[PDB]
Ligand binder design. Structure first.
Ligand SMILES: *[C@@H]1O[C@H](CO)[C@@H](O[C@@H]2O[C@H](CO)[C@@H](O[C@@H]3O[C@H](CO)[C@@H](O)[C@H](O)[C@@H]3O)[C@H](O)[C@H]2NC(C)=O)[C@H](O)[C@H]1NC(C)=O
Ligand SMILES: *[C@@H]1O[C@H](CO)[C@@H](O[C@@H]2O[C@H](CO)[C@@H](O[C@@H]3O[C@H](CO)[C@@H](O)[C@H](O)[C@@H]3O)[C@H](O)[C@H]2NC(C)=O)[C@H](O)[C@H]1NC(C)=O
Ligand code: NAG
Ligand code: NAG
Lengths: 49, 242, 298, 149, 97, 50, 50
């Protein structure tokens, strides 16, 4: 099970910059809900098959 | 148009309708297509004529070797009655203002144009402003923000007005219609139709269709026309005649 | 019931009915009036119910600065000034009776030197110039809200709002008219308009400008009779994506009113303030000034 | 340069009235039977009955430097025909009406305005056009554009 | 001139001792032109000093009045437009194909 | 007015005159009007508008 | 009022206030009133009252 959110490298938290975060920060959460509002949805695609 | 000059010879310094459709070329470099002729005999002082043109070749500017005043800062203010005072902020004794720098135009992209006719000092000159109704202040500039143009008759006039090349191509695919002269017979009832393709070779008038058709006698013939546009502005037209 | 202080518009047309809003001062300050007309059959009512709106927010009294209606989902968005001068945007549902505070409009207008669009976070610095709303607006095609005044705000959701750095705080908004196609015109008390496209974010000045002056003189030697040196902007509005303006002229023998186009494409196409570059070609220098559009053709 | 010009007309005053008529009556009268029966050899059923709408559309076009009448005379002597296309916007109701959008495309007609006319054949001249209006709408966007010649 | 596209006759009148020049179009009755022109006649501006005639372009309906000035008319000749003015100069002859 | 469905137009806001500029079309033909509406003002206490 | 049959009495004529002195009896009990009715003024041409 994977949990994905959107973060901006210029205004992210320190833990997200070193891949140690488990919860998105305020800016990441607001930008993520803005992307859901404007309608952005991720999906995962396996390469070999 | 120079002031204090006789009325009967005003026409020698005036644009006329002959220039409609021609093109202007510069000796250095530059070629522009004339689109309109404007007459305003009162509102601008010293200027009564104008031509609205379109740039194809972006024209050549003055060098700094012949005119050493380019390497300085300009300051333009209102003179007393109707002139404009141009002052060079740099008092460098290499730049100055040469006496050959008369009948030259100084341009800043975004502001008015100024023609220099008098050099009252070695850093101060008098000028006339084309469209002086949008200054309302004293303007300052830098070394590399303004440019000079030499379109005057002094030392030899360096611009030409001449006709332009062919720019419209007619394509008629249907047989027995290529002939430049055509006579077609119609009886009662039967109709005759033809299609043409028009191809531009330069900038083309997208909104206005480029072929106007005229009828000698509208009382005996019925003419139904369709005209559509392509992606690259190729004009397809077709006429049915009955 | 009287003491009506303001009429407020409802642009939309839903439920086979048209809507208007009546705001009243003097008495019933915590209360407003909704007027619905069903095909010429008219009715009005007092929607905020038994409780004054001052029950569910701090302060003592409530003043309804501006209100708006949304026929879809049966909504009312209205901004209330409270007795300490604070402006709170509160939403209200007519199907179920809630009002909920949805924004606490912050004062002491911030700064953005280069932050052309600014998401209004909490950790934001503030400047001495205050904020002063005069109304809002709803663009219901993309379901978004505008806040005008001394500043513009927008959002698609109702969680955060975006501040635009270009529009100053030294000019107050007269009004704002809409294309309902993506074009915003914003008129100020300085009698200056600002044109904004919904796709971008920058707000482009129009009427005191290089392009406008070039257009004006071009019309003057075009010698038409729709342009005069003295004018009064009686009104302006939109129609099929084209900006019309009703302008009166005090010209001698031409003291007349007329409507004329304001083609903004040509108006900012004649904006000569732009980068320029000088190249050398054929041992002569030419201003082959740069191209800022990302493409060539569409 | 060259623009159009539209003023509505009271249909009893086709030629003698060139001024501005206002849209007042919204009832179409039945004064066409006596003229529709005058036809002999035309494919028209005598069983049915017709009835005209009130008001007419007047069209003429102006370019600076000349007079409107000479421009219209030139236009018809060339073959100018005003194409008019009217599109209708449905009223705000959907319970007692529909939202149906309909458009009518017509070509105008030439009309020698009645007067003393010292000239023989060509004289003051103005294009005229019918004016329909359907049941269930108010908003009528009329579009005028050239025939092509 | 006699034009067969519309069966009309075009007169280029100029009153002597007056700078008034005008063009009149008359209808042909049994091969004989009549008074009462089709449309009001076209009066030239007073700047036309001397007219020298007009010519129809062959196999077409383009009329050209030439003299001290040059006017081109399409249609029957009710409307004429400037194309060129010659001050103290007049065109002598015309060759066209 | 409504977004597109308004068959008329009304605009006032003059200096002191109870006149509008009601017109059909899009103010192509500005026909002025003087409203026959009396000029009324409410009274007091509950109300003030002065 | 009528000669004898008026069951009430009404009297105004103040300085500027739209107040009357409506009272029963013969003004034994002067109970002042503020009249609902607003304050209207007609417009022009036909009318003039200023
Ligand atoms: C071309 O069509 C237009 C549109 O109708 C015609 O213009 C109209 O002409 C009439 C003249 O009969 C104008 O009436 C005028 O009204 C004023 C004020 O009421 C009055 O003072 C005049 O004496 C005259 O009666 C009418 O206003 C005008 N339409 C507009 C919109 O101004 C025009 O006549 C047509 N062209 C020709 C050659 O007939
Ligand atoms: C609004 O809709 C109504 C209903 O369709 C329209 O009224 C109807 O219009 C038709 C034709 O215009 C009328 O038919 C005519 O009836 C007379 C008298 O019987 C007959 O002599 C004619 O030959 C023709 O058949 C019909 O009577 C009329 N109905 C009513 C109730 O008036 C109406 O025209 C629509 N509104 C508009 C502005 O078009
Ligand atoms: C200014 O121009 C006039 C006219 O060309 C000339 O006579 C005069 O000497 C000039 N003055 C200066 C200071 O250049
Ligand atoms: C009642 O409301 C008005 C309008 O907002 C306000 O000015 C006034 O201060 C309020 N009353 C009190 C006692 O605060």
């Amino acid at each position: 099970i994977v949990t994905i959110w959107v973060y901006d490298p210029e205004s992210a938290s320190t833990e997200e910059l070193i891949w140690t975060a488990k919860k998105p920060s305020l800016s990441s959460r607001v930008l993520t809900k803005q992307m859901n509002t404007l309608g952005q949805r991720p999906f995962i695609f396996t390469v070999e098959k | 148009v120079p002031l204090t000059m006789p009325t009967n010879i005003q026409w020698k310094k005036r644009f006329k309708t002959i220039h409609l459709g021609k093109t202007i070329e510069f000796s250095k470099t530059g070629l522009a297509n004339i689109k309109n002729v404007y007459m305003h005999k009162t509102e601008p002082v010293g200027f009564q004529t104008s031509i609205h043109t379109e740039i194809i070749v972006p024209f050549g500017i003055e060098n700094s070797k012949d005119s050493p005043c380019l390497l300085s800062d300009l300051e333009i203010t209102y003179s007393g009655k109707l002139y404009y005072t141009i002052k060079l902020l740099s008092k460098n004794p290499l730049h100055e203002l040469k006496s050959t720098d008369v009948e030259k135009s100084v341009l800043i992209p975004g502001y008015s144009s100024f023609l220099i006719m008098n050099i009252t000092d070695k850093w101060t000159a008098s000028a006339l402003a084309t469209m002086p109704q949008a200054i309302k202040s004293n303007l300052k500039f830098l070394t590399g923000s303004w440019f000079l143009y030499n379109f005057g008759t002094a030392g030899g006039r360096k611009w030409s007005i001449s006709t332009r090349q062919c720019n419209y191509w007619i394509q008629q695919d249907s047989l027995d219609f290529m002939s430049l002269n055509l006579v077609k017979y119609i009886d009662v009832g039967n109709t005759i139709d033809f299609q043409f393709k028009i191809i531009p070779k330069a900038m083309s008038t997208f909104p206005i269709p480029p072929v106007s058709m005229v009828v000698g006698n509208p009382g005996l013939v019925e003419v139904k026309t369709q005209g559509v546009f392509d992606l690259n502005e190729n004009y397809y037209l077709d006429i049915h005649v009955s | 019931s009287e003491c009506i202080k303001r009429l407020c518009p409802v642009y939309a047309s839903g439920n086979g009915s048209e809507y208007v809003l009546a705001l009243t001062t003097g008495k019933n300050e915590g209360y407003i009036h909704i007027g619905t007309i069903t095909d010429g059959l008219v009715s009005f009512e007092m929607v905020p119910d038994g409780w004054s709106v001052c029950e569910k927010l701090p302060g003592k009294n409530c003043s309804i600065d501006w209100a708006t209606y949304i026929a879809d989902e049966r909504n009312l968005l209205l901004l209330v000034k409270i007795d300490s001068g604070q402006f709170y945007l509160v939403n209200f549902n007519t199907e179920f009776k809630t009002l909920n505070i949805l924004y606490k409009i912050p004062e002491f207008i911030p700064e953005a030197k280069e932050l052309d669009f600014l998401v209004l976070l909490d950790t934001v610095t503030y400047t001495n110039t205050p904020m002063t709303p005069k109304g809002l607006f709803f663009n219901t095609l993309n379901n978004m809200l505008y806040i005008w005044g001394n500043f513009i705000l927008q959002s698609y959701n109702r969680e955060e709002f975006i501040f635009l750095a270009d529009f100053p705080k030294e000019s107050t908004i007269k009004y704002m008219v809409n294309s309902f196609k993506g074009q915003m015109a914003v008129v100020t008390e300085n009698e200056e308009i600002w044109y904004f496209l919904e796709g971008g974010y920058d707000v482009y000045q129009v009427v005191p400008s290089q392009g406008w002056e070039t257009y004006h003189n071009l019309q003057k030697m075009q010698k038409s009779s729709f342009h005069s040196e003295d004018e009064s902007l009686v009104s302006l509005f939109f129609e099929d994506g084209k900006l019309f303006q009703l302008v009166y002229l005090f010209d001698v023998g031409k003291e007349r009113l007329v409507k004329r186009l304001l083609p903004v494409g040509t108006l900012m196409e004649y904006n000569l303030p732009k980068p320029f570059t000088v190249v050398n070609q054929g041992n002569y220098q030419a201003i082959s000034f740069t191209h800022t559009c990302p493409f060539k053709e569409i | 340069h060259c623009t159009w010009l539209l003023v509505l007309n009271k249909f009893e005053k086709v030629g003698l009235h060139l001024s501005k008529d206002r849209f007042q009556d919204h009832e179409p009268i039945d004064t066409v039977a006596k003229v529709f029966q005058k036809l002999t050899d035309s494919p028209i059923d005598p069983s049915e009955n017709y009835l005209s709408f009130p008001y007419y559309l007047q069209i003429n076009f102006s370019c600076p430097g000349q007079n409107i009448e000479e421009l219209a005379r030139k236009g018809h002597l060339m073959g100018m025909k005003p194409m008019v296309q009217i599109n209708y916007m449905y009223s705000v109701n959907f319970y007692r009406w529909e939202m149906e959008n309909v458009q009518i495309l017509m070509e105008a007609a030439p009309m020698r305005s009645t007067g003393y006319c010292p000239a023989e054949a060509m004289c003051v001249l103005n294009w005229y056009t019918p004016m329909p209006f359907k049941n269930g709408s108010v908003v009528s966007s009329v579009d005028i554009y050239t025939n092509g010649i | 001139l006699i034009d067969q596209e519309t069966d009309s006759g075009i007169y280029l009148f100029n009153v002597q001792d007056t700078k008034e020049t005008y063009v009149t179009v008359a209808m042909l009755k049994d091969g004989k032109p009549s008074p009462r022109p089709k449309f009001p006649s076209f009066h030239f501006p007073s700047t036309f000093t001397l007219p020298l005639g007009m010519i129809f372009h062959p196999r077409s309906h383009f009329l050209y009045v030439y003299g001290s000035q040059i006017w081109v008319s399409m249609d029957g000749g009710n409307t004429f437009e400037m194309l060129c003015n010659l001050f103290s100069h007049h065109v002598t002859k015309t060759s066209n194909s | 007015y409504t977004v597109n469905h308004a068959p008329v137009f009304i605009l006032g806001g003059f200096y002191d005159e109870k006149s509008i500029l009601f017109s059909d079309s899009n103010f192509q033909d500005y026909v002025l009007l003087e409203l026959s509406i009396d000029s009324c003002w409410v009274g007091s206490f509950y109300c003030p508008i002065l």
